[PDB]
Backbone:
């Protein structure tokens, strides 16, 4: 007459497989090297070729098209908006989340979504570049570094995080629980029912700890390593939000999608 924590871990994993269009298995199949192979974006010529095939509407304007850096900024936001939708549906599988007040659900997702985004982003990155456009492009790390300031500063810290995160060799069953734990942080600003959220967090972290013990018997410190990665992600998001605000204020053509503007509003 006890919680079945192995069953819960499997439920979370199944919800992750159902709700996220990208996962580490899918990404690795593509990155390894037959249908729909990824178009490689390594310079301005190949960026523009990729846009004409994969986001035609964005470049179907005359000399009215935006600057390449602003077009990339827009494409990045589009993926974030879609991933926020996936994360919101995923969160329903977390025991207790759907029993919280709506306002607390909103607050947890508001602070958690970009931590989860950058954790899952790691799965589509290697040291040379990253998958984009639902696995149909691969944009090189060096090309993103070549963009004009400040746009060249967006992705490189995420690559830095990812290279170390990927060295932990998590699989999707681990990542699903890590993303659930990110969402269940009881110390987010503005929460109403802190006590119930702390209990929800305790439960999901217990599931995560036991799962890592079973799935990674070789790495006895993997759980505290991941606790530290959660704190690293919070700092990564804080710095990212600061850069997004600089771009919003100084780049008149770089607009922010209204759903993301609300996420960023009063966040840090
Ligand atoms: C800039 C403001 C924006 O910052 C960022 C910063 C880093 C990452 C993102 C979201 N992201 C990159 C999409 C790039 O998308 C294209 C698409 C086409 C293209 O050219 C053809 C170029 C880039 C992403 N990928 C993922 C894959 C798996 C899981 C989660 C994922 O998250 C947004 C924000 O804050 O929303």
Residues:
């Amino acid at each position: 007459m006890t919680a079945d924590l192995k069953s819960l871990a499997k439920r979370i994993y199944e919800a992750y497989l159902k709700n996220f269009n990208m996962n580490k298995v899918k990404a690795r199949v593509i990155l390894s090297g037959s249908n729909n192979p990824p178009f490689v974006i390594h310079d301005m010529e190949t960026l523009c070729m990729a846009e004409k095939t994969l986001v035609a509407k964005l470049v179907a304007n005359g000399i009215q098209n935006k600057e390449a850096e602003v077009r990339i900024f827009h494409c990045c936001q589009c993926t974030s908006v879609e991933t926020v939708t996936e994360l919101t549906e995923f969160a329903k599988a977390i025991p207790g989340f759907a029993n919280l007040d709506l306002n607390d659900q909103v607050t947890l997702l508001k602070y958690g979504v970009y931590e989860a985004i950058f954790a899952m982003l790691s799965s589509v990155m290697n040291k040379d570049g990253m998958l984009v456009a639902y696995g149909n492009g691969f944009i090189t790390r060096e090309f993103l570094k070549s963009l004009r300031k400040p746009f060249c500063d967006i992705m490189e810290p995420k690559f830095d995080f990812a290279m170390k995160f990927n060295a932990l060799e998590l699989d999707d069953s681990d990542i699903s629980l890590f993303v659930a734990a990110i969402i269940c942080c009881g110390d987010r600003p503005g929460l109403l029912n802190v006590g119930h959220i702390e209990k929800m967090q305790e439960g999901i972290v217990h599931v995560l700890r036991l799962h890592l013990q079973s799935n990674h018997p070789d790495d006895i410190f993997l759980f505290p390593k991941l606790l530290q990665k959660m704190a690293d992600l919070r700092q990564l998001v804080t710095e990212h939000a600061q850069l997004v605000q600089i771009i919003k204020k100084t780049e008149s053509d770089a607009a922010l999608h209204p759903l993301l503007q609300e996420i960023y509003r009063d966040m840090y």
